[PDB]
Design a protein around this ligand. Structure first.
Ligand code: ZN
Lengths: 147, 103, 69, 167, 134, 304
């Protein structure tokens, strides 16, 4: 477009982010589709044990203050989930970090109860990886899916 | 007399004032020395944060980001790593010249 | 058209081993499992190329207008 | 640009009185009697010196006089006009570090002049800028001078006297 | 400081579709109404059946700002106990009176205590460790 | 803290088989991002000579213009680098190609009707029917003769067919060598394949003596497992001999008695070569390109 009454409309009215829900029945139309959905049930799986150097690298590979993604103007890290033998991080704690660092600090953390499409018995003896439970901006239980 | 002031390009809008959180954008790079340096920076115990990134693989871009704990700016921890990326090649050559010549 | 010069995956030189390959088949009556193997091809990316090659250059060379008949 | 245009008018014009050059320093240095009270307090607030590109614009021009006008303001009694060998000591050793945000060439010449006549001794702080250190608008206007020695040889016939030479 | 301290007795080590994480189940020897339902990285810390744990939940080591990996010469409460995690209690629940059964999420590794006197000293603090000696 | 002089005490090299076309050597206790970076140079950043520019004068044959222009460029010309310098192609042809950057080649092949008596073979029926790539002649341009008295330009693989010709057809062209690296075009690759693999480690868990030891050979390549009797029930001779097959993890009797997995710090680099340079020296063109890819960062002004 060719003037400034239109460039504001393409940034405020008919942009993509305001078109998140359909105006048909309010269902979403954005979203990751094939690669990452089946990829995400591996990082959120319980066997994801990142080491120290990977943990910033998976964080810095998706979060760049240089290009300006963050809000805190410095990438902040979490304590690992294993301390004494060998310090390892966790993939649910990566989703804890990428909710910490692209959400504003004035608001507090998130809280969410949600289900999956994985039934509980696929992980062993009735474990609770169907109930995706966010508390205080953390992925404390549950694997991330299309749902 | 010519400085090539376009290689080690330090972005400033993601840079701490004290220099303990610096921001680069290295051209004529990709995953080649991106991960070869990121290994060697993270061996320095003063370094608190070091990842290397690529915004888009098409052109030559390598945004890396050193952050430290204290008493050393991130550029002063860069140049220890590039000192210890060279001294590795001192070790590899004189342990691979010493084996070609040893048969 | 003629034998390709390098393998399409690895990077080893292939074209000098095509007419040197039919001289392990028309003469020694070898099987391809030794005929490809005796040359030096030992990665299957560069071993489905001398085996498989159509070599339709011969059906082109019969159509020459720079010769009487 | 006008604070850069004013800086090279004063030190390239011959027919101005010596009491008229102090009239500049009756207000330009008095402009530094106003920044010393008012805005020496935003540096401890978390902010760099990129907001003060207006402030180092005029501060170049006052040192652009000092790099040229040196043998004018003597007296018989060994003093200077409003302590010229004490004003550039105070506004450099402050908490603003002007040695980095002034150009090297204009500080190469601020140093040799302040060594012979004993004005400033910031030499060990000039040395302390390797471990101390968008950007293009702050290097060119610390080097663009509106009254350069002219390439034209013919117009200087009309301007042989009214334009100052090197020395 | 220490919130909880006991010695448990492993019965079930469930492999259950994982290569590294085994949902341990145990109960104590001292008390009888208290158990454990803990995920541990069995690659780092092998746990078989019929063993003796020491599940000690502490509150810190012996406020510090930054977690940094260890230097040469400090002294920690994690020095003597062989496997240490970090986690929060995300749900409190009571089955009956003096059968209060807490929960935890040790980084994505769920734990379930149960008991009667741990209502005194197990808050749902966002900094609550886990430890095992022997 | 991790000293780099502890790295020297944990870095060994086992050169196994060193030939003038391939070298199979080991790197003990180095990282998958340092040893990748060596492998990251040896494909791409090593300089190697080939031809971008094919000046046709005459070609009427069946293999057309850009195709035979392509297949000259894929020929590894046995030209040692560091005896040419780099082109500076920001300026036109008048000084772009010198006598010092470019090696100049020519092809002149004419096919005629050869009368011969008998289904008839094409080498006896025609004179110069098959354009072999040993027909590339080095034209010594400029001063390229006082120092090429022991390194004349020969192609490294001479028997490459380039074209097949019939009578009447000829090929007259002029070729220009350019000094290049394998990021731009594939044809400047200095290697067949400079890949590594990583040392597997096979751990028996339960002792598999007897009949479980004899059937245990056929799951693996042969020179790996050594079984004798009850005593000397099994061991591993050399897992370097063992490629990763995982045949034994098809068997249900053995799917819980063994552990397969790499030793994460023993890189078996087996670098072959296309023919331009020896593998045991293009690896030295990666231990000294890395060392001179850091100096271009280190001794360089950190801008702004
Ligand atoms: Zn191949």
């Amino acid at each position: 477009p060719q003037n400034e009454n239109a460039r504001a409309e393409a940034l405020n009215l008919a942009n993509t982010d305001s078109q998140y829900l359909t105006p048909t029945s309010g269902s979403p139309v954005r979203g990751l589709i094939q690669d990452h959905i089946s990829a995400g049930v591996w990082l959120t799986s319980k066997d994801s044990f990142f080491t120290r150097e990977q943990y910033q690298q998976y964080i810095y590979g998706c979060i760049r203050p240089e290009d300006g993604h963050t809000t805190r103007s410095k990438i902040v890290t979490l304590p690992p989930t294993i301390f004494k033998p060998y310090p390892l991080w966790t993939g649910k704690q990566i989703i804890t970090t990428v909710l910490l660092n692209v959400t504003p600090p004035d608001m507090p953390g998130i809280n969410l109860i949600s289900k999956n499409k994985i039934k509980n018995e696929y992980w062993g003896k009735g474990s609770l990886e169907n109930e995706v439970l966010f508390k205080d901006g953390a992925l404390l239980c549950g694997i991330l899916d299309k749902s | 007399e010519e400085p090539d002031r376009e290689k080690i390009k330090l972005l400033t809008q993601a840079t701490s004032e004290d220099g303990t959180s610096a921001s680069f954008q290295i051209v004529e790079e990709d995953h080649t020395l991106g991960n070869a340096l990121r290994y060697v920076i993270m061996k320095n115990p003063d370094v608190e944060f070091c990842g290397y990134s690529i915004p888009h693989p098409s052109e030559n871009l390598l945004n890396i980001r050193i952050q430290t704990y204290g008493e050393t700016t991130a550029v002063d921890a860069l140049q220890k790593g590039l000192k210890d990326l060279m001294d590795l090649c001192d070790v590899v050559e004189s342990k691979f010249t010493e084996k070609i010549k040893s048969m | 058209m003629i034998v390709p010069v390098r393998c399409f995956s690895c990077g080893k030189v292939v074209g000098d081993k095509w007419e040197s390959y039919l001289n392990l088949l028309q003469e020694d009556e070898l099987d391809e499992g030794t005929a490809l193997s005796r040359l030096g091809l030992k990665r299957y990316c560069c071993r489905r190329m001398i085996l498989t090659h159509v070599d339709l250059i011969e059906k082109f060379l019969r159509y020459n207008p720079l010769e009487k008949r | 640009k006008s604070l850069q245009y004013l800086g090279s008018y004063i030190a390239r014009a011959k027919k101005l009185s010596r009491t008229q050059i102090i009239f500049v320093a009756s207000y330009l240095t008095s402009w530094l009697n106003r920044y010393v009270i008012e805005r020496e307090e935003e540096v401890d607030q978390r902010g760099g010196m990129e907001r003060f590109k207006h402030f180092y614009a005029a501060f170049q021009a006052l040192c652009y006089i000092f790099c040229f006008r040196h043998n004018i303001f003597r007296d018989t009694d060994g003093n200077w006009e409003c302590e010229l060998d004490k004003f550039f000591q105070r506004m450099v050793i402050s908490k603003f570090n002007p040695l980095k945000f002034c150009n090297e060439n204009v500080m190469l010449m601020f140093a040799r002049i302040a060594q012979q006549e004993s004005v400033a001794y910031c030499f060990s702080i000039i040395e302390n800028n390797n471990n101390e250190r968008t950007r293009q608008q702050f290097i060119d206007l610390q080097s663009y001078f509106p009254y350069d020695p002219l390439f034209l040889k013919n117009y200087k016939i009309l301007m042989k006297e009214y334009y100052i030479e090197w020395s | 400081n220490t919130l909880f301290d006991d010695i448990f007795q492993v019965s079930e080590v469930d492999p259950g579709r994982y290569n590294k994480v085994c949902r341990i189940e145990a109960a104590s020897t001292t008390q009888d109404q208290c158990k454990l339902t803990l995920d541990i990285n069995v690659e780092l810390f092998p746990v078989a059946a019929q063993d003796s744990l020491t599940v000690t939940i502490a509150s810190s080591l012996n406020a510090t700002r930054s977690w940094r990996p260890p230097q040469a010469g400090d002294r920690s409460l994690a020095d003597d106990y062989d496997y240490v995690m970090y986690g929060t209690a995300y749900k409190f629940e009571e089955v009956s009176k003096d059968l209060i059964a807490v929960y935890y999420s040790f980084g994505g590794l769920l734990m379930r205590l149960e008991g009667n006197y741990r209502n005194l000293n197990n808050l749902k603090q966002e900094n609550a460790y886990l430890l095992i000696r022997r | 803290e991790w000293n780099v002089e502890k790295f020297k005490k944990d870095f060994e090299v086992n050169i196994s088989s060193l030939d003038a076309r391939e070298a199979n050597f080991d790197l003990i206790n180095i990282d998958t991002s340092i040893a990748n970076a060596f492998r990251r140079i040896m494909i791409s950043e090593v300089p190697s000579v080939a031809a971008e520019y094919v000046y046709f004068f005459n070609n009427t044959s069946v293999i057309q213009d850009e195709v035979l222009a392509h297949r000259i460029g894929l020929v590894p010309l046995k030209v040692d680098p560091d005896m040419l310098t780099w082109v500076d192609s920001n300026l036109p042809d008048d000084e772009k190609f010198t006598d010092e950057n470019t090696i100049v080649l020519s092809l002149n092949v004419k096919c005629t009707r050869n009368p011969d008596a008998p289904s008839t073979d094409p080498k006896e029926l025609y004179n110069n029917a098959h354009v072999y790539a040993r027909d590339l002649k080095f034209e010594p341009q400029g001063r390229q003769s006082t120092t090429f008295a022991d390194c004349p330009v020969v192609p490294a693989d001479p028997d490459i067919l380039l074209a097949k010709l019939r009578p009447g057809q000829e090929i007259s062209l002029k070729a220009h060598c350019i000094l290049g690296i394998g990021g731009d075009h594939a044809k400047f690759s200095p290697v067949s394949t400079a890949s590594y693999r990583l040392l597997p480690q096979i751990n028996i868990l339960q002792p598999i003596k007897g009949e479980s030891a004899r059937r245990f050979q056929k799951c693996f390549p042969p020179g790996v497992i050594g079984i004798d009797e009850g005593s000397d029930e099994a061991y591993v001779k050399d897992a370097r001999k063992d490629t990763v097959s995982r045949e034994v993890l098809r068997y249900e009797e053995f799917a819980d008695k063994v552990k397969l997995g790499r030793v994460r710090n023993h890189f078996i680099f087996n670098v072959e070569s296309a023919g331009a340079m020896t593998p045991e020296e293009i690896f030295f063109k990666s231990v000294r390109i890395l060392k001179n890819k850091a100096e271009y960062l280190k001794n360089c002004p950190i801008t702004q």
